[PDB]
Amino acid sequence: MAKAAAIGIDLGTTYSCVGVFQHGKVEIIANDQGNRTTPSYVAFTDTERLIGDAAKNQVALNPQNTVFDAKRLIGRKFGDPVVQSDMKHWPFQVINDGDKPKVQVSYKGETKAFYPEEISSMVLTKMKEIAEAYLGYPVTNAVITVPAYFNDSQRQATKDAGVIAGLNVLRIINEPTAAAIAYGLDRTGKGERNVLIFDLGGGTFDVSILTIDDGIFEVKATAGDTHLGGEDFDNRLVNHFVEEFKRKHKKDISQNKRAVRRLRTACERAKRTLSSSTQASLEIDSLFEGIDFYTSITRARFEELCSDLFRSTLEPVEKALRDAKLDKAQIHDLVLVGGSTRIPKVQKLLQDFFNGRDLNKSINPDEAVAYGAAVQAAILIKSTR
Ligand SMILES: Nc1ncnc2c1nc(Cl)n2[C@@H]1O[C@H](CO)[C@@H](O)[C@H]1O
Numbered sequence: 001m002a003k004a005a006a007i008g009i010d011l012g013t014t015y016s017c018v019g020v021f022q023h024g025k026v027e028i029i030a031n032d033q034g035n036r037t038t039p040s041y042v043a044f045t046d047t048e049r050l051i052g053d054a055a056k057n058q059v060a061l062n063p064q065n066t067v068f069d070a071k072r073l074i075g076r077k078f079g080d081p082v083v084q085s086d087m088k089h090w091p092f093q094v095i096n097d098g099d100k101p102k103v104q105v106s107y108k109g110e111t112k113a114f115y116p117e118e119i120s121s122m123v124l125t126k127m128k129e130i131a132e133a134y135l136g137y138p139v140t141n142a143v144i145t146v147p148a149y150f151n152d153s154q155r156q157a158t159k160d161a162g163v164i165a166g167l168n169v170l171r172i173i174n175e176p177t178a179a180a181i182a183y184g185l186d187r188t189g190k191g192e193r194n195v196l197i198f199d200l201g202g203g204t205f206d207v208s209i210l211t212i213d214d215g216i217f218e219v220k221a222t223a224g225d226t227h228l229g230g231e232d233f234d235n236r237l238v239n240h241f242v243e244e245f246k247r248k249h250k251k252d253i254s255q256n257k258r259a260v261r262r263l264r265t266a267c268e269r270a271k272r273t274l275s276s277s278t279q280a281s282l283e284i285d286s287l288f289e290g291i292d293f294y295t296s297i298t299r300a301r302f303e304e305l306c307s308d309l310f311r312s313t314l315e316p317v318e319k320a321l322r323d324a325k326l327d328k329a330q331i332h333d334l335v336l337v338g339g340s341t342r343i344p345k346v347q348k349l350l351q352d353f354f355n356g357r358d359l360n361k362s363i364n365p366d367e368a369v370a371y372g373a374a375v376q377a378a379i380l381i382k383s384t385r
Pocket of ligand 1 (some may be wrong): 203
C-alpha cells in the first residue's frame, strides 16, 4: 500500500514539484490551488506559518519574515563567500550559529531562527502533504534531487531536510540525471550516450553534460550562471514599462514599491503569454496616481529587451563542451529543463548553436526533473520490496 509507494521530489531554488509513478504513468501532482509547481517560500506571520503559493502571495506585505533561496544556503558555512555575497540581497536576516548560517525571523510575535535544512524541510513537508492528499494515504518513501555540482555537505543537508520532513530518502539524485531518466535516455541499450541538459529556471542557469554507458551515469561537465534566470527577463520588461510610463505621463514610478511589484507580477504573466502568442497585453488598473496602464508588447520587442541575456546562455554551453572535451556533433541528446526554456528565442538560439538539431522538450520543462525522480523512486521501491 503506502510501504510499496514512493514519490519523486524536485526541490528547486524558486519552485518545487512532486510526481508519482503509478499504473504505468507519471502523475505530476497539483497542489490545493491546482498548480503543478509550488513556490519554495516559507512565510512566518503573526498567526501562522505559510508555505508555497500563500507565502509567495504575501511577500510584499511581509518581506523580512518571508524566506526563500534556502537552497543557496544549505550545506554551507556562514564564512563561505557565496553566503556573504548573497546575504546583501535578501530582505530576511541571516545570522551565524557556530560558523553555520541560520535565518532569523519574527513568528507569532517571537524571534525564531532556523537552519536552512529546517526551512527546506517545511517545503518538503508541503510536497509530502500534496502527494498524500492526491493518493489518499500517507507516502513516506522519496527520491530528492539536487544540482549535479552539489558537494557531500550539501547532499547530506538535503537528506537531513528529508528526515526532518518525515520522509524516508531512498536516494539523493542529480537533477540532470533525473531529466535524462524522464526521457528514457538510459534505456537505449549498449554504447556510450552523450547528453546535454540545458536548465534555465527562475533564478539559476545550469548546463550539464552526462555520459550514459550501459545504464551507468557519469557527469562530464557542469557550467552555468547561479544568478541568471527567468526573474532577470521580468526585470528587463519592468524597466521597459517604467520608461514607457515616463514617456506617456511624465511620471517616474520606480520609487513606488507597490507600483513596481504590481508591474513585476503583470510582466511575469505577459512573458509567459509571449511563449505562445506574438503579443501580450498588460491591464493594470490605477497603477500610479490613479492612472491605468493598458498597453501591449510584441515577442520581437521582448526578444530585443533580453537579447544579451539569451545570447549569454551559449558561453556556459561552449565552456561545458570544452571541459567535457566534446565537439557539438558528439552530443547525442539535448534536454530542456526549467520554465524559461519555453521561450521560443532561447530554443532557436540553442537549436542553431547545435546546427539545427531537434530538442527534447515534450515533457513540461519545469516538471521533467520531478518526472524522472518519480520513475527512479518507483524502480528503487520495487527493488526494496
Ligand atoms: N511559458 C513560459 N514562458 C516563459 N517563462 C516561463 C514560462 N513558464 C514558466 Cl514557469 N516560466 C518561467 O520559468 C520560471 C520557473 O521555472 C519562472 O521564471 C517562470 O516565469
